Amino acid sequence: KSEQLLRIDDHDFSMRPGFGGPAIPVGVDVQVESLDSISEVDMDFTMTLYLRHYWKDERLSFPSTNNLSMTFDGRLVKKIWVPDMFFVHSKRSFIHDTTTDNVMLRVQPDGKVLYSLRVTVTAMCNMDFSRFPLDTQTCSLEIESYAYTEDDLMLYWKKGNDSLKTDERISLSQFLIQEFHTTTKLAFYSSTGWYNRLYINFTLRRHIFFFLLQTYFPATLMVMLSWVSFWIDRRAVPARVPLGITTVLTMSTIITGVNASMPRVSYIKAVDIYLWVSFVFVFLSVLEYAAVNYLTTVQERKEQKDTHAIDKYSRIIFPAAYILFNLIYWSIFS
Amino acid sequence: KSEQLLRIDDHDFSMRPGFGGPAIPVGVDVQVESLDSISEVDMDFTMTLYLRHYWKDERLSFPSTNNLSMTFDGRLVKKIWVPDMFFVHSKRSFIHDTTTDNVMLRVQPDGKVLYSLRVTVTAMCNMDFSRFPLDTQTCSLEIESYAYTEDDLMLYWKKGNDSLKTDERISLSQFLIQEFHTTTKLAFYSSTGWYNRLYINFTLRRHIFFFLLQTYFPATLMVMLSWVSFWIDRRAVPARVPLGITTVLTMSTIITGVNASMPRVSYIKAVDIYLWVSFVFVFLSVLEYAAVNYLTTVQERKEQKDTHAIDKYSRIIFPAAYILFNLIYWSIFS
Amino acid sequence: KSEQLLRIDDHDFSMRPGFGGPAIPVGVDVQVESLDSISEVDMDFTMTLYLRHYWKDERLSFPSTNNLSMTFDGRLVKKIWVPDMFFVHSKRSFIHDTTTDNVMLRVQPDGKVLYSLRVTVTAMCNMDFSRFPLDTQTCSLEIESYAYTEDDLMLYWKKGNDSLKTDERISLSQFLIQEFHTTTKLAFYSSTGWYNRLYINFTLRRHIFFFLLQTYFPATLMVMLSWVSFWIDRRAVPARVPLGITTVLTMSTIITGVNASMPRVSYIKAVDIYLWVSFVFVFLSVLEYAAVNYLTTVQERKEQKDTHAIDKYSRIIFPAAYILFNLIYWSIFS
Amino acid sequence: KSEQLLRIDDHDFSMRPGFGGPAIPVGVDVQVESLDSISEVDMDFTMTLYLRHYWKDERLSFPSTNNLSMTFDGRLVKKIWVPDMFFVHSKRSFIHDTTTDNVMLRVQPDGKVLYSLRVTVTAMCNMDFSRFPLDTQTCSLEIESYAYTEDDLMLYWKKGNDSLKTDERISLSQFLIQEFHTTTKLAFYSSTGWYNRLYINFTLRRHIFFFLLQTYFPATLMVMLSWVSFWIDRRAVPARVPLGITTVLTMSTIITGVNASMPRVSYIKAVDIYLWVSFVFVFLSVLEYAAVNYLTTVQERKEQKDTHAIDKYSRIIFPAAYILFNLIYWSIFS
Amino acid sequence: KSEQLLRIDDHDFSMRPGFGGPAIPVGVDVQVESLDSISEVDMDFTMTLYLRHYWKDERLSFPSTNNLSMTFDGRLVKKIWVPDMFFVHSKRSFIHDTTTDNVMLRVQPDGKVLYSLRVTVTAMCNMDFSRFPLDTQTCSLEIESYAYTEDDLMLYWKKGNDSLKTDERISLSQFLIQEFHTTTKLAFYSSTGWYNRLYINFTLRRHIFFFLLQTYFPATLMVMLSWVSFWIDRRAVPARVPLGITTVLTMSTIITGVNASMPRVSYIKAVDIYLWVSFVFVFLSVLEYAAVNYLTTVQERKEQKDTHAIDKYSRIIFPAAYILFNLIYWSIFS
């Protein structure tokens, strides 16, 4: 019997190998299969990957005439001792079990053990949307032992930076993924001790042109369209008056639609400043003609008892101010 | 064997230590890892944390030549006696189990036991939105024993206020978190007895300027824009008439969008009063010109058979009334 | 050992106490902790509560020198016999298990047993929205034994109406809860027999003023605003014409927003009648001026080859009809 | 002991009764408790019901002096042999387990067995929305044995059509349920053999008047309102021009709202044809006046160098065409 | 006993048949039952199917006088050795278990075994929406062994292309399914070795006419309606001015509604180009009349101190440019 060549009943597998002595080293390899989703409101991402472990245990040695290793499944895991890695700062995770548990075990004749499993994990990631939609985000995934400190278990990447592999077809619907690399660091708990921690890092970016076309183009078009009133005859009140209020209504509807399209992040972003500055420009364009009309009526009544200079100066002042605002805005936000 | 140094089979672990005598004291430490989400419609929040227990049991003592403690996992938990803390007023909760159960056990040679586990819990919190968006909310998390009254188990914070730790990077997308502290209180059940309860408290706040810019600015702009009609010549009926109805339409669309953006809380809030008062002002601005036009037509027909005084008085009355309303409103709602 | 004082191995716990004889009485107490949510589309509600059982079993008696009772947990439940209550007309439910099963057992020396557990349940409730938003709903929760008929198990409230307790801070975001009381009734199954059933009843109400302000106010304002056209000079066609169509557009947008705000209940409610009657009034106000203008043009052309009487009669007829409709509507719907 | 009167250890319950001989007949009864929900996008429905089984097994006979039957629970199910019915074409299902498994067993002294359980199941149903909202749907639920063909197990309704019962208060929020009946049929699998299958059928209908009032009324009102322009003086260009474009805008907003209100079924339905035909009529009403105005201007310029006939003919042609379209449409779609 | 004819206790079922020798061949058959849903944001699909396995094991042979095979359930699976197939690139999956596990076993007297189970699986699929709504997508489902390489287990389709069957009533609400076929390929893992993989492929298509009618028709209608202004008298400023701004508002609302209706794919698609080109045309139509009016006013003022040529040329230039754009667009996008 396979479980009789291995002396399962003769050893206490509730304790780590080398109990009471130096720490046992464990090597780790990771292969990333896919990135499933990302949430901007809850600030988390989902990943599916393969996790592998490497260690040696003399209690699992068996006599053999050659180097043929045996293979087992998740049923033997509950009997032998195995590491207890967990994902730090994770929200939820599970191990796939169809059509059975995705667990394998390979034992060398001298006692070397390979332990692999397939897992999906959701982890948190703090994001800053102040520079939206020109922002860039960085995320990380962390692995650590739960029960054993550095004095009992030593955790490291088995092959350095070569221990990380990624699928050729990994992609996201609305982000660009790049710059995968791994690092290590020591963690401290005030009541427990010191622990080793591993990291996997990557970066995300957006598509700029889509957001530009969807947001900045209509606002600029409406602002430029509001300047048309400066060239219409001032005597045509029933034509000059409705144009401004209709432009205001159009801008308000555009802003409402843009707000409805974006995720519910409740603080000021870069796009809001541009939109509301455009709204203020459209607002001032309406008061200009009211002032002009009042002055014309007062002059006519006084006379009773040619282009106005305000239009002539507005035709020059408004585009220059808009260009200056655009220059400052695009110099600040790169 | 580790489970033979501990006399597992020689003791009845179905009863608490010191059964039939004084209550056994248990100490508790908590470390908060993250706040996951918050719901304003269901009135609850989600938290992930570490929970630790401290107690002594002579039945778990083992002989040793030094102070080296043993370490175990969740498999030994089902055999020995452990406390039964639960979260009061919680909706749902679970213990993480990837890649295995996040449970540890450390036993001192003299019988002192440390028991720790990692858990995510969702708890209810009553909220009042009468002062939205200038409201402030307070939340609490409660811990209590389920089966043992104060005559059998005594629960306390092990190190007073030093028993609570929070992560350095805890944050929320739309709230500001502050003022973490712990308290204690006694609870009474009419059919069961008295129990000790522990509390963890914190406060939440919003970003005022975002809501101000998104809501109060356009309404004030539209109200000020409606006053322009008071300065246009009364003889230009086809210019005076459409302006009011278009302003009414714009205000209605703005109110509809604002209502669609907010969560579905079905009672009156502070913002609604401001919005509907602005709507009423815009409404009255339309009836003013109708009265003026009717009076002018009646006068002209009588004569057949200069600014009107109503406009002159409106130009002064409307802004003063709006300023008085703003002063009263901002004095009441701080 | 505790499980040896109780003769667990000497008795067949697969059969109820007093098997083959009279029915065994069981008492029930309930404490309501919170109401979690309510769905108007799926017609269900969620509740969390404590459930307690009382019965006597001589097979669990143990010798003792005093009245000290023993305490156990969910592990002993799988060995002894326990009642099998279930929730009738429920959709889903579960028992909390963090950090362990929320189950307790207390056994008196003479054999009296107390059995308590904590559970969350979702139950259906038929609702009628014909009188929305002035409707009132009544809901109930039902408890019954699954396997044992009244000839084998007798179920009753232990202390009558005093067996129901409710939390002091139970509340809902959009409803008012009142009138908790309990009743009993007998149930019949054609293929199984008769069963006892228990009931918990309560009532729900809404906030009227919020819905009034959000719906009835703008429609009335628009209807009153449409009457302004009756006082404008009939010769100002470019002013009379756009007002009606703009009012129609505003009313249509308001109705669309109100429909989008309400839940998807696909049959006629009270508010829809009011909204569409207002729409019909606004519609007729437009045809009135078309008739007036056609008559004026015909008269002028005939003459070629002062207020119109229609306006004079409309100024009186329209408000009277609207007031009559309001009186009838508010007399029918209380 | 109850489990010793039944010779559990003396029989191999891994094989069906009468193994190697004729098929064993099994009777089935069903009682429907409620219909929980229905999805028009995923095309499925949810149901909760009671399922009962009837068969005889001599291996479960016990000696008794009378006809008193014994009662058991789900614990005995794992030892004795039971049928293996499953729901064909189902997406997900589960058995209720609060406060324990909803399973009962009753065994007669001669070996007759009754087996009942409570289950919730979600099943698919193909739907056709071409005639929306005047469509009618039919759904079915299927029961079949998984492992045993007709040569080993014979499945039938125990009492014919009397085996189906429905709750008195079953209802849906947006559908009308009627015509419950049962049928039987034989199923064939190319690689396994023949199987018996049972069916439960019902029909669903909608509320016509709600959809009529919400959709067809405003479109007809707008189409009739667009005809007003035919009676206004052609010389009033600033009154004739805006009316058409404002009607077009109103119709577009109504269509957008109606599309937003309906579920996301991505193919043409009956309502879309009506809406777009109305839109085309409103579109043509605008080109009519443009042609009239161009002809009038050309005539005036020629003369420089009374109602137009087009209006006179349009006043007759447009309503007749609309009535003909309505007659054809309502004759085709019943 | 059935489990005593099979020598369960006499064999070590932790190792594959023929351990230490040549690979054991396993045959696979699949029957597709239904396609449940498809997500365009998460890029995945859900499928329900039957999975069957074929292999021979001499350790399960039993003596029999005829060719009668025995039948078992999921309880025997935990004792005998079974293959360990899993779904590659899957997100989540489960095995149905109502009213019991959907697992069957049939063993021939000579040791041939049939193993079948029912499973639902969700798998990822990369999609490209650049040609929306004229895009075409291809999807695949993959099956592979987890623990055994090609040197230990050989996987193949049992009957070639005849091993795949599909239900007669499989359909989707918004897609057309076609072209089911199977393929095979070898997979390599750098740290584990080589594996055999199986594929199931199919194609999806959309309904073109629905999207055409919903999107392209109103934009073309609005563009054609904007050309009407070229035929109105230039002296009617209060009629020429509002038409353009109202058309702009209508186009903006249509674009906002279309964007709200589509799924949140954040990059440029084919429809957006058409919509924004139409918007630009409508925008230029407004500047044309502003230029014409300014020139007319300048000429009149100069004279103080007939159709304009711009209109005559625009009437020809605008439709020709629109037709050229349509030809190029529909030649590029087929």
Ligand SMILES: *[C@@H]1O[C@H](CO)[C@@H](O)[C@H](O)[C@H]1NC(C)=O
């Ligand atoms: C791994 O490679 C990355 C590439 O950016 C580098 O930053 C990092 O320092 C490397 N780490 C090690 C341990 O070599």
Ligand SMILES: *[C@@H]1O[C@H](CO)[C@@H](O)[C@H](O)[C@H]1NC(C)=O
């Ligand atoms: C803990 O500190 C908080 C800080 O606000 C204080 O309110 C509270 O009383 C302290 N509790 C104890 C037990 O010292």
Ligand SMILES: *[C@@H]1O[C@H](CO)[C@@H](O)[C@H](O)[C@H]1NC(C)=O
């Ligand atoms: C309990 O009190 C309620 C209060 O409304 C009453 O209606 C009911 O009849 C009472 N029931 C009993 C059993 O006393």
Ligand SMILES: *[C@@H]1O[C@H](CO)[C@@H](O)[C@H](O)[C@H]1NC(C)=O
């Ligand atoms: C059951 O009754 C229904 C009622 O419509 C009928 O159609 C059906 O044929 C009946 N079936 C049997 C088996 O009697």
Ligand SMILES: *[C@@H]1O[C@H](CO)[C@@H](O)[C@H](O)[C@H]1NC(C)=O
């Ligand atoms: C199966 O049939 C498909 C039909 O398209 C074909 O492409 C494929 O090559 C065939 N495969 C085999 C193994 O015959």
Ligand SMILES: CCCCCCCC
């Ligand atoms: C791809 C379109 C880019 C448009 C940019 C507009 C910036 C104002």
Ligand SMILES: CCCCCCCC
């Ligand atoms: C944080 C600065 C915001 C400024 C917004 C100005 C809008 C007119």
Ligand SMILES: CCCCCCCC
């Ligand atoms: C609100 C517009 C008033 C314009 C007055 C201008 C006085 C110079």
Ligand SMILES: CCCCCCCC
């Ligand atoms: C913002 C333009 C102001 C122009 C003022 C001109 C005064 C003669």
Ligand SMILES: CCCCCCCC
């Ligand atoms: C950061 C913008 C604040 C705007 C406040 C407006 C109050 C009416």
Ligand SMILES: CCCCCCCC
């Ligand atoms: C609770 C007072 C609400 C007052 C609203 C007034 C709206 C005009």
Ligand SMILES: CCCCCCCC
């Ligand atoms: C509805 C407006 C009527 C105005 C009448 C004014 C009489 C002084």
Ligand SMILES: CCCCCCCC
């Ligand atoms: C609200 C302004 C009223 C002004 C009335 C003036 C009467 C001469």
Ligand SMILES: CCCCCCCC
């Ligand atoms: C609290 C505001 C009530 C408004 C009622 C309006 C009824 C037409």
Ligand SMILES: CCCCCCCC
């Ligand atoms: C059930 C009667 C509905 C009447 C609606 C009338 C809308 C004009």
Ligand SMILES: CCCCCCCC
């Ligand atoms: C559609 C309006 C027609 C008005 C005709 C009135 C004839 C008295």
